[PDB]
């Protein structure tokens, strides 16, 4: 422990999440990502089952990291005097969904369906584990290009899932729902569904629909690319202005546009290889 267990490589990226380095676990040459967070920048703290006081991000990652899933899993973590270091899986080769959509433009609906289905399964898995991500967006989704699997990252804005109202939010505003913009109040699942509507529009049109507060609360969805009427209907449903008018996850996955999804390996061979 701990500079002896891992070989550190190039900086992958930095920002509101911290600084993330490529790495290799010396034990077995498993590729990892090594994420450093400074203690002074951490706003939300939690307690591990053992009672150890850790960043909420560690709490949430531990709750979602058991078993296989579409979430980048936490393998280990360490406390330093001024920071926490998180050891995470690193699929290879990868590209995040933001860069993927930038380079390829609007995605074919078959490909958007496969990606969107996998994001729904991943978000369902988080909610089943008691975890609300609160920052679903293309920047927080990695694509394993060989396996055709999508992986959720960056739980640094998340929370334990509850059925009462949330009055705090630190995710991405252009993915946040109109009830947050207008009233600084939202419920977890219906807010998640809103961000998934933003994400689906992003995939099939090549960029997000709203950039300004007035557009978010105006709730008019102009389609800038050719999109089937069934996909348009699902998007507009997810972006219903009234939270209670939005679909549940079950209603999304039962939607006609969502049927006959490709398998992950079919998605890779057809669209990614």
């Amino acid at each position: 422990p701990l500079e002896s267990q891992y070989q550190v490589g190039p900086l992958l990226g930095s920002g509101g999440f911290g600084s993330v380095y490529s790495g290799i676990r010396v034990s077995d040459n498993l590729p990892v990502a090594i994420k450093h967070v400074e203690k002074d920048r951490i706003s939300d703290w939690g307690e591990l089952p053992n009672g150890t006081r850790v960043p909420m991000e560690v709490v949430l990652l531990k709750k979602v990291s058991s078993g296989f899933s579409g979430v980048i899993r936490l393998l280990d973590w360490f406390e330093r005097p001024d920071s926490f270091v998180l050891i995470l899986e690193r699929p290879e080769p990868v590209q995040d969904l933001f860069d993927f959509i930038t380079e390829r433009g609007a995605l074919q609906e078959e490909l958007a369906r496969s990606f969107f289905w996998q994001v729904l399964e991943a978000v369902r898995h988080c909610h089943n584990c008691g975890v609300l991500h609160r920052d679903i967006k293309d920047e927080n989704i990695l694509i394993d290009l060989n396996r055709g699997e999508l992986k959720l990252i960056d739980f640094g804005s998340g929370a334990l899932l509850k059925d009462t109202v949330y009055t705090d939010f630190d995710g991405t505003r252009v993915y946040s729902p109109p009830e947050w913009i207008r009233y600084h109040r939202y419920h977890g699942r219906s807010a998640a569904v809103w961000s998934l509507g933003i994400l689906l529009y992003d995939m099939v049109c090549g960029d997000i629909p709203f950039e300004h507060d007035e557009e978010i609360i105006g709730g008019q969805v102009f389609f800038r690319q050719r999109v089937s009427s069934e996909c348009q209907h699902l998007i507009r449903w997810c972006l219903a202005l009234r939270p209670s008018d939005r679909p549940t996850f079950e209603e999304i996955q039962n939607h006609p546009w969502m049927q006959d999804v490709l398998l992950p390996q079919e998605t890779a061979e057809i669209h990614l290889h």
Binding site: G15, G16, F17, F98, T102, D135, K137, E139, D154, G156, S157, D170, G171, T172, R173, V174, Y175, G206, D207
Partner: peptide
């Protein structure tokens, strides 16, 4: 048309 990332927070 400009496409951009959006920081969290």
């Amino acid at each position: 048309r400009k496409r951009r990332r959006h920081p969290s927070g």
